[PDB]
Design a protein that fits this description.
Chain A: Component of the sarcoglycan complex, a subcomplex of the dystrophin-glycoprotein complex which forms a link between the F-actin cytoskeleton and the extracellular matrix. Chain A: It comes from Mus musculus. Chain A: It is found in: Cell membrane, Sarcolemma; Cytoplasm, Cytoskeleton. This is part of a larger assembly, with chains A (106 residues), B (105 residues), C (48 residues) and D (105 residues). Chain A contains no helices and 12 strands. With 106 residues, chain A is mostly beta strands. In chain A, the strands form 2 sheets. A 3-stranded antiparallel sheet of chain A has the order 4-5-6, with no helix packed on it. In chain A, strands 7-8-9 form a 3-stranded antiparallel sheet, with no helix packed on it. In chain B, the strands form 2 sheets. Chain B has a 3-stranded antiparallel sheet, with no helix packed on it. Chain C is 58% helix and 0% strand. Chain C is rod-shaped. In chain D, 0% of the residues lie in helices and 46% in strands. The chains are: A mainly beta (106), B mainly beta (105), C mainly alpha (48), D mainly beta (105). At the A-D interface, strand 1, strand 2, strand 3, strand 5 and strand 6 of A face strand 3, strand 4, strand 5, strand 6 and strand 7 of D. The complex binds a molecule of 3 linked components (NAG-NAG-BMA) (2 copies), a molecule of 2 linked components (NAG-NAG) and 2-acetamido-2-deoxy-beta-D-glucopyranose.
C-alpha cells in the first residue's frame, strides 16, 4: 500500500508485524485495551493504557528475567521479590517498628 | 466487511479516530515480542488469561519528567517510594545485610 | 472474575474455500458446446 | 461478505473507524512482533514501550495492578495514596536512613 487504509468491522489478523525501518506505533485518544479469554470465551485478564495510569487487571502479575528466572511477583497471597535485594530511594528512608535481625551492616 | 489475514500483516502505524477507542482481543493469549537480526526473542510480554508476565532485561516505570518510581532489573529492585514503613510487631529478619549511611533511633 | 461480556467477538469459523469446480465447469462447458455446434455448422454449410 | 487475504500484506497505515477491533484468529493466538524496532503503545502522554532490553512505562502516576475478583489494589505506584508494604523474600536492603530501635544478630 501507499497511504492510509480505513477499516470498518473487526479485523481477524493472524500475526501483526512491524516495518524493518520504522517502529510500530499503536495510538488512540481514550484508551488502549488488550484483553484475553479463557476456554469459555470470557474476559479474565486485561491491560489498559488509560488516560493517566496503566491498569493491569489479572490474578497474578509477574516479572521475570530473560532466561525465565523470577524477579518479582504480586498476587492475592503477598508480594514476593525474587532477586534477593531491595532498594528504597526515598529521602525519609525506612521506618522500622520493633527490631531488626541482620548479621552485617554496611 | 470482516477481513481475515492468513499471513503476517505488515503495518506502520495503527491510529484511532478521535473519540473512538482502540481494542485488541484474542481467544487464548496476546504476546508482544521483539526480535533481533537473527530473529531470537529478546523482550517479551504475555497477557495471559490469568497471568500477565513480562520478560527481558529490565522493567522500569518513570514519570513524564523522568524519575524512577519502580525498576526491577536483574541485580536489584529499585522503588521510588519517599518513605517505606514496616509494621511488623515481632521484628523483621534480613538474612544477608542492610546498607545504610545513617542509623537513628 | 468476569469483567466484560462483549458478545461481538466472533472469529470467522473454519470456512473452507468455495468450490469453484462446478461454476468453472458450467462456464467452460457452455462455450465448449457452443464452439462444437459452430464447428458442426461450419462443416455442414461449407462442405455442402 | 468476508475477504480472506492469503499473502504477505503491507497495509501501511491502518485507520479503524467503527466496530473494528483488531482480534486474533479462531482460537490460536494474537502475536505482535517488531522486527528490531520498539513496539510503542500510546494514549495522549501515557506510554508503554517494549524496546530492546528495557520495557518502559511513562505516565504522570504510574502502573497499578488490582485483582478483578476482589477489586483491591494489590500493587500501586501512587505511593502517597497507597503506602508501600515490604515484600517478602528480601535478603538485603539498601535504604537512605533506617529509623530502627535495636539491631541484633
Ligand atoms: C475505554 O474507552 C471507551 C471509550 O471512551 C469506553 O467505552 C465506553 O464505555 C462506557 C461505559 O459503558 C459507555 O457508556 C455507556 O455505554 C452504554 C452501552 O450500552 C450506552 O448504552 C450508554 O448510552 C453509554 O454510552 C460508552 O458508550 C463507551 N464508549 C464507546 C465509544 O464505546 C470503555 O469503557 C473504556 N474502557 C475502560 C476499561 O475504561
Ligand atoms: C498462554 O499464556 C499462558 C500464560 O502465559 C500460558 O500458560 C503458562 O504457560 C507456561 C509455559 O508452558 C507454563 O509454564 C510451565 O510450568 C510448568 C509447571 O507447571 C513447567 O513444568 C513448564 O516447564 C513450564 O515452565 C505456565 O505454568 C502456564 N501458566 C498457566 C497454565 O497458568 C499458556 O501456555 C499460553 N498458551 C499459548 C497457546 O501460548
Ligand atoms: C539496549 O541495548 C542496546 C544494545 O546493547 C543499546 O545500544 C547501545 O547504545 C549505546 C548508546 O546509545 C551505544 O553506545 C552502543 O553502541 C549500543 N550498542 C549496540 C550493540 O549498538 C541500547 O542503548 C540499550 N538501551 C538502553 C535504554 O540502555
Ligand atoms: C464455520 O462456518 C461454516 C459455515 O459454512 C460451518 O459449516 C462450520 O461448522 C463453521 N466452523 C466452526 C468451527 O464453527
Amino acid at each position: 500500500l501507499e497511504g492510509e487504509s480505513e477499516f470498518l468491522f473487526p479485523l481477524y489478523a493472524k500475526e501483526i508485524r512491524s516495518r524493518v525501518d520504522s517502529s510500530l506505533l499503536l495510538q488512540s485518544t481514550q484508551n488502549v485495551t488488550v484483553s484475553a479469554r479463557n476456554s469459555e470465551g470470557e474476559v479474565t485478564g486485561r491491560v489498559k493504557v488509560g488516560a493517566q495510569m496503566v491498569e493491569v487487571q489479572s490474578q497474578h502479575f509477574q516479572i521475570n528475567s530473560e532466561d525465565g528466572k523470577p524477579l518479582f511477583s504480586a498476587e492475592e497471597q503477598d508480594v514476593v521479590v525474587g532477586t534477593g535485594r531491595l532498594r528504597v530511594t526515598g529521602p525519609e528512608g525506612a521506618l522500622f517498628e520493633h527490631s531488626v535481625e541482620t548479621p552485617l551492616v554496611r | 466487511g470482516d477481513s481475515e489475514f492468513l499471513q503476517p500483516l505488515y503495518a506502520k502505524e495503527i491510529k484511532s479516530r478521535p473519540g473512538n477507542a482502540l481494542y485488541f482481543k484474542s481467544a487464548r493469549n496476546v504476546t508482544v515480542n521483539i526480535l533481533n537480526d537473527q530473529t531470537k526473542v529478546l523482550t517479551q510480554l504475555v497477557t495471559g488469561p490469568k497471568a500477565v508476565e513480562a520478560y527481558g532485561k529490565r522493567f522500569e516505570v518513570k514519570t513524564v519528567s523522568g524519575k524512577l518510581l519502580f525498576s526491577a532489573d536483574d541485580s536489584e529492585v529499585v522503588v521510588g517510594a519517599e518513605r517505606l514503613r514496616v509494621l511488623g510487631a515481632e521484628g523483621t529478619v534480613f538474612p544477608k545485610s542492610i546498607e545504610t549511611p545513617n542509623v537513628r533511633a | 472474575g468476569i469483567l466484560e461480556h462483549d458478545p461481538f467477538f466472533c472469529p470467522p469459523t473454519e470456512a473452507t474455500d468455495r468450490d469453484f469446480l462446478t461454476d468453472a465447469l458450467v462456464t467452460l462447458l457452455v462455450p465448449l458446446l457452443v464452439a462444437l455446434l459452430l464447428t458442426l455448422l461450419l462443416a455442414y454449410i461449407m462442405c455442402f | 461478505g468476508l475477504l480472506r487475504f492469503k499473502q504477505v500484506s503491507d497495509m501501511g497505515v491502518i485507520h479503524p473507524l467503527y466496530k473494528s477491533t483488531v482480534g486474533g484468529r479462531r482460537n490460536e493466538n494474537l502475536v505482535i512482533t517488531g522486527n528490531n524496532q520498539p513496539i510503542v503503545f500510546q494514549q495522549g502522554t501515557t506510554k508503554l514501550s517494549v524496546e530492546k532490553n528495557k520495557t518502559s512505562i511513562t505516565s504522570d502516576i504510574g502502573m497499578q495492578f488490582f485483582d478483578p475478583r476482589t477489586h483491591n489494589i494489590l500493587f500501586s505506584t501512587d505511593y502517597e495514596t497507597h503506602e508501600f508494604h515490604l515484600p517478602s523474600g528480601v535478603k538485603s536492603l539498601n535504604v537512605q536512613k533506617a529509623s530502627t530501635e535495636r539491631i541484633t544478630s
